[PDB]
Structures are given as structure tokens and as C-alpha cells.
């Protein structure tokens, strides 16, 4: 089923290599676009596609966490002297092993003395004792990451095709990786080692990464990165995510539960006789009724196509830029001949919206339908088709066969507020075939749960 990608139309600059006190070469220069292909023959058709643009993720931090289901059972002791409900039994301690009860559950004890004698004697000052219980909710698991900090890599796809009796044959197929932050990077591409690919970036890549705490769900296994107030590994804010953390075994616990439990659990006696009390947790991100989540970055951030932990090793996260600037290529060889070829373009329909994202990115979130090759856009003044052109663009769809693709089109500041018309036309298409639509403009800017014990009192009088 071997097939070449749409060979884009690219101007080629002939440069001459400098010389030493020896034996008069030449270099073929061109600017390749992200998600487009370049084709040439050596005088076996050679193709290079700038497939992926990635910023690296690591700096370190990593920790699995969950969402806890909290339940607190208490008991009152009317006589302040009593052996039942004491500082040694309740203050800073986990309720000792039940032997039958769930392994997933995690409990902590808190001591509430100096009570009011309600349903008691006027002189004796009561005391309250509680078991705060925590278990994972819906078995929800997430990795917390201190997230992508850019290093930039380009991923190219080199394929050499041959036309053997009516059909194309993918002879050689490699993945080329080149670091974009330094000077030119050079390597051979073909097995014959005759040709060399030289990649050079103009400056920093189109878009940028924020430094902070991120996370995504785990399926017992990385997913689309989300952003919601989350704790750095060394921090333990109860109003932010990750205070309910998973250790090695898969057991979830409250981060420094023992010690902190008394600062976050607050209970007062309602009536010591009936064994009634007012209870709450001074925290967030717990069940019941204290947990929702932020949508993936992909969804909220137009400049982001995808942001995911790369694999099972959980060492790097890959941020795929919605679109990126072109890269500078030079193809060099001894002394022979190079000819560059190009295919043509087609387009059924399109859809999209003009967006200024939270990180101040002005782009056209374009989606093409049954399209291939070089596609030319024209952003118009007003909603009226035929109004004055304010920007002109060209997108390159790499699929040989007309397919549906989604892309990011950087726009100048002239493409200001309000809805407007945009007209797309493929290459060499008559102005009758030109699709127009009015496109929309969007812009992003920059409690007490009272319960009666239930378990009954074992110590009445």
C-alpha cells in the first residue's frame, strides 16, 4: 500500500560550498514547513516530511496522586477524666489495624476536648474523638508533573519510493531527529550515505511552554495534560491537588496525615447524650461534593495540539505545537545532480475560528475537508466576501490522497476583533472553486456535614 506524500512546491536556492587547499561542491537550500513534504530525484524518488515538532518536558518532578472519599465517625465522652477518648488514643495517630477492613482505606484520628456539657452535667467538660477515613474515589489515578521546559527537537520522515509496474514502493524509511536550539545539525539520510540533510532554526519555536505543575489521568498510563491548582512535590496545601498520594505498592495516603489531620479536621459536639456532632474538612479536591476538574490543555489552549506524557517510562512529556514556523534545510552530496518535484492541491470545504488564546496567541484554528497539496487563504476586511484582503496565507497538506486535517494559522495584529470572511482556494484553481465563509472571532484573557454517630455509645455513664 506504499505511497509518497504530497510533494510541495518549494523555491530552491543553489549555494556553493566554501573550499580548502585541495579538490568544488554545491548545496541545495529550501525552507521546509511543519506538516509538509519535499521531493527530489538524484541524477528512486527521495522524500522528506517534517512530521513532528516537540519541546521537551523534563524538569523533574513526578508523583502519582488520587481523589479521596472522606468519612468521619466520632464518639463523645462526658467525663473529662475518662480512659475512653484520650490524647494518647486519638491525637496524632492512625486508627490501628481492623484485620478484615479494606487495604485501600487510610484512616487518621483527631482529639476534640474542652466541650460544652449538652445532654450532660453542668460541671463536667466533655471530649470528642474521631476517625477520619480516606479511600480512592472511582479508582481515579493521576500523575503530577513539573512540566515541559523546552528543548526543541524536529522529527523528520525520510522515505525513498520506486515506481515498479503500475505502483509505488517504499524502499527505505527512516526517522530523522534534529535539535533546533543550537547551530546547524547534519547527518546522512539514505542507506548509500550519498546525501546529507542539514537542519537550522531561525530562532525560538513558534510557541512556548509555561513553567509549573501539570497532571493527566492514568489508566493502570499517560493521557492529555490538564491544569488545576496542584502541589509541588515538597508542598502540602490542602486547597490544591495532590495531598492524597500513591506510594510504590499502590496504597493512597494523606501526605503527612498523622501530623496535619488536626489542622484540617474540625468537629464540635451537638449533644453528648444523643452522640451528635458537627463535622468538616478544611480542604478541597475531596469526595463527596468537593471535586471537579479542569479540561485538558489541548481543549483550552489553541496553540497546543497535544500535551501528553510520552510513554510508560514516565521520563518525558511531549508538547506538540498547533503549528510551528518553517525550518531551514540544505541538501548536499562528491558532485552530481538534484531536481525537485511537486504535486498539486485540492479542497472540498473548510471550517475554523479566529482565536486569541490565554497566552496571547493570535491564530486561525483551520480545519480542511477532503484536501491535499498547497492551499491558499485570503483573510478579508469585513464579513462580506469580496471585501479587502488584510492577510494572505498558504498551508500545505502532506497527504497524497485528499483527507481531513486540522491546523494552526498564525495571524498578524491587523486581523483584529469582530467576525470576518476568509477565502480558501487550492493551487491553480479557478476563482469559481474558491470557498468562502464568515469566520467567528473568539478571545481568551490572561458546607458543614452534621451527623449522629450511628455506631452508638459503648461508654454511656
Author numbering: 12 to 34, 38 to 57, 79 to 255, 258 to 370, 375 to 487, 524 to 538
Task: Give sentences copied directly from the paper behind this entry.
The consistency of EFF-1 proteins on the more spherical vesicles allowed tomogram sub-volumes to be averaged to produce a 3D reconstruction of membrane-anchored EFF-1. Our 3D reconstruction reveals that the natively membrane-anchored ectodomain of EFF-1 has an asymmetric elongated shape. It is ~13 nm long and the region most distal to the membrane (‘head’) has a cross-section of ~6 × 4 nm2. A narrower region (‘tail’) leads to the membrane. The ectodomain of EFF-1 observed in the crystal structure is in the post-fusion trimeric conformation, whereas the native membrane EFF-1 structure determined in this study is monomeric. A protomer from the EFF-1 crystal structure was first fitted as one rigid body into the determined EFF-1 EM reconstruction and gave an overall good fit with a cross correlation coefficient of 0.497. To further improve this fit, the protomer was subjected to four iterations of flexible fitting using Flex-EM25, with each domain considered a rigid body and flexibility allowed only in the hinge regions. Our structure and the fitting unambiguously revealed that domains I and III are distal to the membrane, and that domain II is proximal to the membrane. The flexible fitting of the domains yielded a ~16° rotation around the domain I–II hinge relative to the crystal structure and a ~19° rotation around the domain I–III hinge. In this conformation, the distance between Glu 245 on domain II and Lys 400 on domain III is substantially shorter than in the EFF-1 crystal structure (reduced from ~12 to ~4 Å), suggesting a possible electrostatic connection.
